[PDB]
Design a protein around this ligand. Structure first.
Ligand SMILES: *[C@H](O)[C@H](C[C@@H]1CCNC1=O)NC(=O)[C@H](CC1CCCCC1)NC(=O)OCc1cccc(Cl)c1
Ligand SMILES: *[C@H](O)[C@H](C[C@@H]1CCNC1=O)NC(=O)[C@H](CC1CCCCC1)NC(=O)OCc1cccc(Cl)c1
Lengths: 306, 306
């Protein structure tokens, strides 16, 4: 028992991280087979940021302008292309440590592990959720661009995030690995703000089930509620609407705990209206929304990876 | 910016995890050079747990009783010995993925990453602290024994924990890698309880500095306090005494933030006496004590590993 924010084991991704230097900018790249993926703003300079035309900027580059270092072995770039907001550097050596992998674009509310990196070297690993406003609340300093977020499925690494920038509230924005930003953000230095966020309701419910699985029950009640009247309460507390699809996703946890989904909704209602009154749940004094239902099942059942 | 509970990158340790089977028990082992380290209670059986004499139990074993599997390659045991509560299985193949490493016994209040494992396969990675009562609040199911905790220093893996059991409060107990339990616990099935825990004061202060570095300042004040009068307040709220050595350890964070250590103590005093009044710090509604001063500096300055 116990319940922690648990990241995926990072080894498969550590073997893919490289340093990409172009001009006065250094950031991280992702080396899979003979291609290095990195944010296209690596080709910007300190005076290009304002409103760059990356097509122009890229046609002015030569392969030899891109300095790619994999540890203490430097990689020759033999070609380059742009895909949305990611640069693909073709190198003359395939990464022998390339895992089985997929590129996936995730939905808000889904979670992933971030391998935070500087100069191609990993600093640490932690679990994030994609917020409803398409930002992540990460831990990123200068040099971290090109760090990736990922999930692991049995043996396969699903890459879903590459880091590009920090918004003025201190939250983070980036792309999928095909270079499409999450959210309305652009890799331009302009007025950009996160926008209003909401709590991921289905995740809070998953975490309440985690708590029950682990012996916290003080928040349960005999009441129930309908999905309608729950969502009426959710809206007032800035929670995402709970859908019938969410309810079905919470099915397995409901079976295992013997607590119908709509009964856990009634418990969440009372926690929203009354607060926790100095109680904690799973070591938290706040309702936690960065565990998906699958995260809970994985951790409370012991799934592993090969 | 941002601040997360960040684990060390786990790749170096993933390449050392193996499955150890003896009799009806399966658990994890740590394969470094030609030795596999695992909890000695692997040699117990379902009727041995009550009060086993492991010396007797071990002299009755043959090498071929230990089934060691490194993925889909099975390892022959060519010898076995006992060191305190860990079994050392000598195998005829050295692990080619052995990192540079140390065994270290940590002090309460120090943190480490846990690579949670089942059947020799990693499940997830997360950050723990050794509690003052020598337990850890982990996330461990049956089969997780032999999972290890570790820190990384530049390029070197310092192993500091191997998992053995869960106490009745749902917290976890284990040994250093030389087999000495942390705390008064024994690998015997008897009445064993964690004992009273306390909050790691120097860590709370580190985390308050993390908050300032990241733009939370609402808890600061103009007051100061003496180390004596702080510890008088600490005792009443079940906090560890703050030592002059703790104060000196918090020096770097004090410089960088311009906030004298004793002024941050005055801020912690008021948080203890008044609570947070519905405020949060770094996303938490509780005072967080599982970040050491070194953790804060590492994360807020961007240290990496090779
Ligand atoms: C890439 O390593 C870097 C990561 C940022 C720095 C601080 N936190 C992060 O996550 N990204 C940038 O610095 C980014 C660069 C621009 C270049 C032109 C196209 C759009 C991206 N700019 C950025 O994030 O500005 C905000 C910021 C806040 C605080 C410190 C800094 Cl250095 C930047
Ligand atoms: C080893 O994989 C296992 C890890 C425990 C199981 C549940 N959570 C854990 O951390 N350890 C044990 O099962 C341990 C075995 C004894 C054997 C005799 C010597 C001392 C250790 N016993 C144990 O932890 O009992 C408490 C417990 C609580 C809940 C479930 C279980 Cl299966 C055990």
């Amino acid at each position: 028992s116990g319940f922690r924010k648990m990241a995926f084991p990072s080894g498969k991704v550590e073997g893919c991280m490289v340093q990409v230097t172009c001009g006065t900018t250094t950031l991280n790249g992702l080396w899979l087979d003979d291609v290095v993926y990195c944010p296209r703003h690596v080709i910007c300079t300190s005076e290009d940021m304002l409103n760059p035309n990356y097509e122009d900027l890229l046609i002015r580059k030569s392969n030899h302008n891109f300095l790619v270092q994999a540890g203490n072995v430097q990689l020759r770039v033999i070609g380059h292309s742009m895909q949305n907001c990611v640069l693909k550097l073709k190198v003359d050596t395939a990464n022998p440590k390339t895992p089985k992998y997929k590129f996936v674009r995730i939905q808000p509310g889904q979670t992933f592990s971030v391998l935070a990196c500087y100069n191609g070297s990993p600093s640490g690993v932690y679990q994030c959720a994609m917020r409803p406003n398409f930002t992540i609340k990460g831990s990123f300093l200068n040099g971290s661009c090109g760090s990736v977020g990922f999930n692991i499925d049995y043996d396969c690494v699903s890459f879903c995030y590459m880091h590009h920038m920090e918004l003025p509230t201190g939250v983070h924005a980036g792309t999928d690995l095909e270079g499409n930003f999450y959210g309305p953000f652009v890799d331009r230095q302009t007025a950009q703000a996160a926008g209003t966020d909401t709590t991921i309701t289905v995740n809070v419910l998953a975490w309440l089930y985690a708590a029950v699985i682990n012996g916290d029950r003080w928040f349960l009640n005999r009441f129930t509620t309908t999905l309608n009247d729950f969502n009426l309460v959710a809206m007032k507390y800035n929670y995402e609407p709970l859908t019938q699809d969410h309810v079905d996703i919470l099915g397995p946890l409901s079976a295992q705990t013997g607590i119908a989904v709509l009964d856990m909704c009634a418990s969440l209602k009372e926690l929203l209206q009354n607060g926790m009154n100095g109680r904690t749940i799973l070591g938290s004094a706040l309702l936690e929304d960065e565990f998906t239902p699958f995260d809970v099942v994985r951790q409370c059942s012991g799934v592993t990876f090969q």
